[PDB]
XYZ file of N, CA and C in Angstrom:
99
model
N -11.973 -7.875 -1.914
C -13.245 -7.445 -1.634
C -12.814 -7.221 0.168
N -14.211 -7.191 0.536
C -14.340 -7.024 2.237
C -13.958 -8.371 2.706
N -13.457 -8.212 4.035
C -13.159 -9.505 4.840
C -14.531 -10.691 5.055
N -14.295 -11.448 4.342
C -15.221 -12.762 4.117
C -16.766 -12.356 4.558
N -17.429 -11.534 3.959
C -19.020 -11.228 3.969
C -20.044 -12.428 3.989
N -21.107 -12.576 4.506
C -22.178 -13.553 4.335
C -23.473 -12.804 4.148
N -24.199 -13.266 3.644
C -25.848 -12.913 3.462
C -26.622 -13.305 4.505
N -26.030 -13.435 5.692
C -26.509 -13.594 6.799
C -26.486 -12.190 7.396
N -25.843 -11.137 7.177
C -26.329 -10.048 7.743
C -26.225 -8.728 6.431
N -26.965 -7.672 6.785
C -27.290 -6.874 6.033
C -26.061 -5.946 5.381
N -26.495 -5.339 4.184
C -25.098 -4.435 3.491
C -25.215 -3.296 4.613
N -23.856 -2.326 4.696
C -23.650 -1.478 5.103
C -23.835 -0.216 4.426
N -24.171 0.691 4.669
C -24.049 2.069 3.841
C -22.748 2.771 3.688
N -22.656 3.757 2.434
C -21.629 4.367 2.593
C -21.981 5.673 1.588
N -21.143 6.623 1.505
C -21.462 7.845 0.822
C -19.879 8.100 -0.101
N -18.573 7.771 0.637
C -17.435 7.857 -0.023
C -17.119 6.343 0.185
N -15.698 6.104 -0.601
C -14.953 5.009 -0.285
C -13.869 4.838 0.745
N -14.025 6.141 1.456
C -13.194 5.895 2.743
C -14.268 5.703 4.016
N -15.391 5.218 3.588
C -16.253 4.951 4.674
C -16.019 3.341 5.074
N -15.351 2.841 4.241
C -15.543 1.216 4.334
C -14.089 1.122 4.943
N -14.023 -0.526 5.080
C -12.528 -1.103 5.203
C -11.788 -1.497 3.793
N -10.562 -1.419 4.149
C -9.938 -1.447 2.901
C -9.815 -2.742 2.523
N -10.161 -2.816 0.688
C -10.775 -4.008 0.009
C -12.109 -3.699 -0.176
N -12.958 -2.941 0.432
C -14.166 -2.608 0.070
C -14.262 -1.414 -1.027
N -15.429 -0.986 -1.554
C -15.385 0.030 -2.387
C -17.002 0.885 -2.319
N -17.129 1.836 -2.768
C -18.612 2.320 -2.308
C -19.484 2.734 -3.605
N -20.419 1.808 -3.787
C -21.218 1.465 -4.756
C -22.421 2.850 -5.288
N -23.128 2.736 -6.349
C -24.111 3.879 -6.508
C -25.286 3.799 -5.985
N -25.641 2.713 -4.864
C -26.853 2.372 -4.232
C -26.629 2.984 -3.056
N -25.451 3.369 -2.367
C -25.045 4.176 -1.116
C -24.982 2.994 -0.270
N -24.502 1.821 -0.800
C -24.159 0.770 -0.014
C -22.607 0.058 -0.209
N -21.724 -0.247 0.474
C -20.584 -0.481 0.621
C -20.474 -2.210 -0.186
N -19.346 -2.402 -0.861
C -19.529 -3.593 -1.824
C -17.795 -4.119 -2.118
């Protein structure tokens, strides 16, 4: 998964898998996971 995320921060948007860091994926709500 992404490097140590926290719920003190909002999710970031995406539209493709390449919009995120390695380890992260792009989901159906248009937010990275």
